RNA sequence: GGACCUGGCGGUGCUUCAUAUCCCUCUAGAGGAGCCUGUUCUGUAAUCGAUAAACCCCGAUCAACCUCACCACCUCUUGCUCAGCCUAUAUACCGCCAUCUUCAGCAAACCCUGAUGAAGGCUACAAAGUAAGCGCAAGUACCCACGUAAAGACGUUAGGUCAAGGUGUAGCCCAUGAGGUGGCAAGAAAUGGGCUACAUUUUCUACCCCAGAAAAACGAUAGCCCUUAUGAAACUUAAGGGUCGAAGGUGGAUUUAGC
């Protein structure tokens, strides 16, 4: 019963400047947890589908960085402890999205980025030739 | 309040090296080319030698930031092997796990 | 900045908002040594 | 005497409540709030996985309870206002390339820490097919010779990677300037060019 | 206890309805697979051990089978073999012996359950020798012309226990072929074998005698076709990447054999398998170990 | 004999939590990580700074909630938000819990120049995974 | 995302142990958290050198230590300006005195800022981290001394002096300084005129006509000076006129109409002041009903922005008047106004929010169908507020009116959760409601379980340090509920507490005990009840002895005891 | 350095040094919990933090950060030291044990009633007396010389029922518990003449021990080997003479 | 002193074994040469620790200055620290480990036997053992369910480390603390490990395997000279070139590793 009668809407103003165009948006998420990456992939794909963005998903081969340390404090050289770090990847390639759509979608998924998951978003922007390169001089 | 006097000395060396980095860079640039006159290069050599010893970056020793260990230090985490093993074994270093393959 | 860390935690202990178990142990040992007669000599004797 | 902890508020949750209301944002797993009998931890011999109350393993998991399918659908419905429509005309990659010959690649890095800076964010890559530039035979040959390895003949693509300036905008401007000067010089003719 | 398990089941039903509401699915048609998927999504855990990962299962699957109290309020146990301490096991033995006595008076599909399975059935802890005794008795029962009346009982303790030919595809020109792949060490080879050909083998676009100037590798290429007596009958196009010359030759050999399986008869395919032409050599380089020279070589001992 | 982070067996009177009960080789196999950040991923930076901050945070919380932490902290880093999930005991008074939560949040936020949240989950007594 | 109806406000730790379980604990927990934050900030500002390392990119200014000590020790106008912006009254006064003695010129603007500070803070150091009744404007103060010593005085200096005097309740001196302003032929501002109106109404206890004439004269003087009145002026007028009530009613409407004509849009503070002026003790139906209806009509669906410091009381006053009028529809309209847009932020402090919601829910329980009442209960408590014992009592009364007593155990559990476990009034109400009339066996057993829990709470009361107090009515009701539900053993064990506390049992309880004793064929229990009745010397005992003799076969010993009791009779 | 500090548990473990080569075969220090008397929010500067070490609300007004005067802080520290020294003194002081046959001998010492049984069985009526404590050593293959305690205990109700048992354990208290719990399952019943003595003179030899017990009149007392006196007090015999010849082995 | 119990030991018996393992058997090595490196000894004013298996390219995934804790000289004294000490004690310890372990047993709590001694506790056609827990196992990582990792309890060697850090005890406080400059860190000689070789299954070249030359030459990563790289500092570090073409001619008993 105690529902808000009216709700204030955020102000989104249509600017008079043309909008950027993104041919590709490759969001490569790196983590240590394949399950976390899979859950984030599900979330991002569902959000993109809801927003109408075309999305494909790839799994770049993981990386395992290993190194060795002396197990004992003082002399037992032959005995070592080997540690490793696993970086698992998930690449979400979004295609044919405008600047505003890319901004909103990226803000969403980045704010919701899990702890321990880093992101590298490569944006391939579409441009026209500058007027100063149209004609020979 | 550093771990020991060796760590304190290294901290002072790092501070002085940072302070004198630019001057050393310029003078070494003067010295490290065959273009300028060798007399000018020699005066540059005597200047760079006259700079204080602790400003030399080579004197900086990479020590563990928690036990001042001068060797067995992983540059990435700046922790000696012992401290790094302690943290990793207790599971307080993200993503680091025992290697088995 | 070990200076910053040590001074901050020492000040917090003195204010009573940080319980330094290690420093309490050291203070207890020093007090017991003082009772035992093992007290740090002054700087001129 | 002492303070008796209240019963968990899950007892008061109806089976048809508003989970997005329960967890709007990313928050740690709260056993008293999650109305699931979820268990975790490797069981002891003839035991069972540890319950959720005090379960540090569940506390460690980066849960997604704030992102359910319903919550995501509602969030995207709210966010649809912010989206602009893709130009329908250039619906295909060929049309994209034809209308917008220059492609600009720039990377943003999202890590965790007090500092957002990342030196790799300043690099800007500019890709353009020479077929898209109005160059004659001589101008094209001179441009290819000038760029050198930056031009891949197989794809016929010139790639200018600028990372000299600290800022991404500066690098983008520098890449555009490099394209302009390369084009104009390639169209230009020098005296020594005769001795080919 | 029983009341505890009942409360747990009620908790599970309520939580299952809550999880169905959370995921938006229908509470009625929410299955255990759906619950597992929803939990895996909501609580992502990368722990390798599946048991250590979050689980929201039925209390029946979670809690171990607890043996109910074996006596009533008066203190009298329920089973006349209670004081043996293994009442269930000895009841089973007694029943088997009775069946054997009745049988004596009157007159590659399954296996025997393991001791763990028998213990699970009997909710009791057994021994190796007890299990062997019971299995010997059951085997005697099986041999003793056990009819349906006895086989129905016996089967309660029974547990049930060829190359995959690729489909033949067709190119644009209507020629039939088969595609296969094979890996040897680090070498991976994809081989396309045509139904009809003059024996040509083009590896990476190069003729095989040029790609593999080594007679051993050419012999390895020959081995599958020569075995099935199909030299000069098939054309092959192979693409091999990774490894050295010998690893590449072995990988191509495996891929060619698998592809040719589609064109040889089933008996020939089985003969190739028996000759070992379809097995993926699992021998790969063994990792070096710390504190020793190599995978097995140890540092020179200093007495 | 390996000693690293192993609670050696006893007469069966030593209670141990899930973390303590598991040796180092069970990290990523049966137990997770107590600090989650992107420092240790390939191509990421500031691993050393994150480690130092984690160590200081653990010591500071241990000394600020004395005899209250029922288990190890969990340090999560999201963007620049730092979330400390701490399991504590239902012994100290809620007034003092709230005072210390506000105090720790503010002090750590000002010290590390980042928004810090401190989520307390209270238990009656330390959760015992097994008796060693 | 809407509000979480099962969760306490977000500022609290979402843990069952740390979740507040009462209004008092809510307020105390918030105060403790704020105190911890204050201590942290005090430490940060006391030892700033530990927090000067900026590892934040982008830089975060709000997470930097604040420096309050002046950094310009040179005796100059620049250093004095540094101090005045730092708001250091004593240091600024000393530096101004030293500079004046040195003889160097001091700018009029700088002296004006010094005034601003001194006259606003009453020559008292503004409260720092660490180192109501009456008038604070001292006769001899640094502000007045510097004003007199000032070489050149300007309109703004006089305005600030008057405003400070009025703020510190120096109304007569403010009026005087206005008089010298006029004598010196200077023009004041709207803020000075607002302060002067406040002083005019707060100076002397003159009659309404005199005060109104003075206010009109001041307004005419403002018009002559061409100073344009602002929203604050009219709000001060109404707030001052509150006192006269009836005499000020109509002119308040005149002032509101003047606001509308001028274009100074009325605010929530204005509507609050008008409503409180018209809400005089007596009969609100005469004028308060109409005024509140009209105000709600005007305010319907109007997002509000903060325009006056007192805008955050309109909702409290509106809910108060709605509760007084018992107009549930008007209360709903006010609630919808609060919920519209972002109006909810105007509810006000914790006490105001609690009072608003307590009135709203009491009115709901009084004048709404029980199903909607329960829906509102669930939505509001504990998410909105923590109820008071009186609100829970009103909820119980509404449940009784609607004849839905099957939820009384739920209400008792909720009371325990919200901290009314040991409230005598609530416990008595619940017990009376449960034991008033008989009910089907299921309701009876539920009531018996609730009564057992209530008895446990009574036993475990914190008053146990003091001698345990058990009301006789509560004892009777608990015994009756146990007997009706079949816990005759517990009733028999409880009967001893009657003698222990010298509490008079109930005739209905005794009758039920006799019925149970006859059912069980327990002459000993019947004689025990008769003995209790005789000890309490109830008149009904005379006939009850005969009733027991007739119903129960009497042994020789029981007959001897009854003969002794009759001899006592 | 702040980062080199450890916790109280680890510091006490290292300092006390219970585990170690020394303790392996015995080839003192007291663990003081320094957090016992400390109060959260109490420091040497005497700050009064509202809500942590002082009441949040004072007379309806939110308190504010204040500092105790120097003399007040001195008083607080003096009180803290007083509590510390009182606790230490009450820890150091020990209660005088009631000795058995000799001051340092476990023999003759009471152990209390046997532990209650499972099936609603209680032996509060029974008293337990230690007759011997030995430290038997056995050489094991790995753990060199191994130390164990063999205890002999006698339980009895003073009304005829009396039994005895031997308990073996690595720990003295576990040995006592084992022996006294096993004794109650091995109770003899002794016939006492007139509830104060034996029915007739008894001369017996068990292995190499001769016991010559003489029936005696009332008030004669127990003139017996001290162990026999203990066992007779357990059984319920008041008057008897007893001479032990041969080996005086306590168990025989 | 007599008789026993437990353990250790037996140049102690029978039986079955060791699966890269004890002998033979198979392959490649060390033991012979030069060089690199560690250690012992000598030398010096010039560290310390490991030092039978379980030390000896070991702490060091590393010493020109720094590192550095050593020596010579000089300088400072509430000293970076609400001091400091790489000062003694690893035979007080925590911490991390070697070792059997390339094991499978350690076991609390009970019960029983021995006359109720230390002690012992099994026979499956079963004769007093039941056992939580730990370990093994299982589960897990890598490429399978194999293999390798990982794991490997209780204990043995007062095994190693006070020099990772912390710490008990003891010791110095105008110095056993702190700072600066300079300096040793070498070879009489022995010995451990590794690299290069002694060649024709080899050397140089082209190619990455269908060749041409070499062949008493093969053989230094050493020696000497020059240049370059890093550095403030290079005869004393690395790389390259030049120059030289050395010992040696498949290595004694003995010994290492490999399924
Ligand atoms: K050799
Ligand atoms: Mg260096
Ligand atoms: Mg090992
Ligand atoms: Mg004595
Ligand atoms: Mg061998
Ligand atoms: Mg040699
Ligand atoms: Mg040495
Ligand atoms: Mg030595
Ligand atoms: Mg030196
Ligand atoms: Mg040196
Ligand atoms: Mg020294
Ligand atoms: Mg040792
Ligand atoms: Mg291993
Ligand atoms: Mg295993
Ligand atoms: Mg030793
Ligand atoms: Mg040693
Ligand atoms: Mg010295
Ligand atoms: Mg040479
Ligand atoms: Mg040079
Ligand atoms: Mg030659």
Curated annotation (Swiss-Prot), chain B:
<dbReference type="GO" id="GO:0005743">
    <property type="term" value="C:mitochondrial inner membrane"/>
</dbReference>
<keyword id="KW-0496">Mitochondrion</keyword>
<comment type="subunit">
    <text>Component of the mitochondrial small ribosomal subunit (mt-SSU). Mature mammalian 55S mitochondrial ribosomes consist of a small (28S) and a large (39S) subunit. The 28S small subunit contains a 12S ribosomal RNA (12S mt-rRNA) and 30 different proteins. The 39S large subunit contains a 16S rRNA (16S mt-rRNA), a copy of mitochondrial valine transfer RNA (mt-tRNA(Val)), which plays an integral structural role, and 52 different proteins. Interacts with LIAT1.</text>
</comment>
<comment type="similarity">
    <text>Belongs to the universal ribosomal protein uS14 family.</text>
</comment>
<dbReference type="GO" id="GO:0003723">
    <property type="term" value="F:RNA binding"/>
</dbReference>
<dbReference type="GO" id="GO:0005761">
    <property type="term" value="C:mitochondrial ribosome"/>
</dbReference>
<dbReference type="GO" id="GO:0031965">
    <property type="term" value="C:nuclear membrane"/>
</dbReference>
<dbReference type="GO" id="GO:0005763">
    <property type="term" value="C:mitochondrial small ribosomal subunit"/>
</dbReference>
<dbReference type="GO" id="GO:0006412">
    <property type="term" value="P:translation"/>
</dbReference>
<keyword id="KW-1274">Primary mitochondrial disease</keyword>
<dbReference type="GO" id="GO:0003735">
    <property type="term" value="F:structural constituent of ribosome"/>
</dbReference>
<keyword id="KW-0687">Ribonucleoprotein</keyword>
Curated annotation (Swiss-Prot), chain C:
<protein>
    <recommendedName>
        <fullName>Small ribosomal subunit protein mS33</fullName>
    </recommendedName>
</protein>
<feature type="compositionally biased region" description="Basic residues">
    <location>
        <begin position="31"/>
        <end position="41"/>
    </location>
</feature>
<comment type="similarity">
    <text>Belongs to the mitochondrion-specific ribosomal protein mS33 family.</text>
</comment>
<feature type="region of interest" description="Disordered">
    <location>
        <begin position="29"/>
        <end position="45"/>
    </location>
</feature>
<comment type="subunit">
    <text>Component of the mitochondrial small ribosomal subunit (mt-SSU). Mature mammalian 55S mitochondrial ribosomes consist of a small (28S) and a large (39S) subunit. The 28S small subunit contains a 12S ribosomal RNA (12S mt-rRNA) and 30 different proteins. The 39S large subunit contains a 16S rRNA (16S mt-rRNA), a copy of mitochondrial valine transfer RNA (mt-tRNA(Val)), which plays an integral structural role, and 52 different proteins.</text>
</comment>
Curated annotation (Swiss-Prot), chain E:
<dbReference type="GO" id="GO:0032543">
    <property type="term" value="P:mitochondrial translation"/>
</dbReference>
<keyword id="KW-0689">Ribosomal protein</keyword>
<dbReference type="GO" id="GO:0003735">
    <property type="term" value="F:structural constituent of ribosome"/>
</dbReference>
<dbReference type="GO" id="GO:0005743">
    <property type="term" value="C:mitochondrial inner membrane"/>
</dbReference>
<keyword id="KW-0007">Acetylation</keyword>
<dbReference type="GO" id="GO:0003723">
    <property type="term" value="F:RNA binding"/>
</dbReference>
<dbReference type="GO" id="GO:0005730">
    <property type="term" value="C:nucleolus"/>
</dbReference>
<dbReference type="GO" id="GO:0005739">
    <property type="term" value="C:mitochondrion"/>
</dbReference>
<feature type="region of interest" description="Disordered">
    <location>
        <begin position="282"/>
        <end position="303"/>
    </location>
</feature>
<protein>
    <recommendedName>
        <fullName>Small ribosomal subunit protein uS9m</fullName>
    </recommendedName>
</protein>
<keyword id="KW-0687">Ribonucleoprotein</keyword>
<keyword id="KW-0496">Mitochondrion</keyword>
Curated annotation (Swiss-Prot), chain G:
<feature type="repeat" description="PPR 9">
    <location>
        <begin position="388"/>
        <end position="422"/>
    </location>
</feature>
<dbReference type="GO" id="GO:0003723">
    <property type="term" value="F:RNA binding"/>
</dbReference>
<protein>
    <recommendedName>
        <fullName>Small ribosomal subunit protein mS39</fullName>
    </recommendedName>
</protein>
<feature type="repeat" description="PPR 1">
    <location>
        <begin position="72"/>
        <end position="106"/>
    </location>
</feature>
<dbReference type="InterPro" id="IPR037387">
    <property type="entry name" value="PTCD3"/>
</dbReference>
<dbReference type="GO" id="GO:0032543">
    <property type="term" value="P:mitochondrial translation"/>
</dbReference>
<keyword id="KW-0699">rRNA-binding</keyword>
<dbReference type="Pfam" id="PF22330">
    <property type="entry name" value="Rib_mS39_PPR"/>
</dbReference>
<dbReference type="GO" id="GO:0005886">
    <property type="term" value="C:plasma membrane"/>
</dbReference>
<dbReference type="GO" id="GO:0005739">
    <property type="term" value="C:mitochondrion"/>
</dbReference>
<feature type="repeat" description="PPR 10">
    <location>
        <begin position="471"/>
        <end position="505"/>
    </location>
</feature>
<dbReference type="GO" id="GO:0005743">
    <property type="term" value="C:mitochondrial inner membrane"/>
</dbReference>
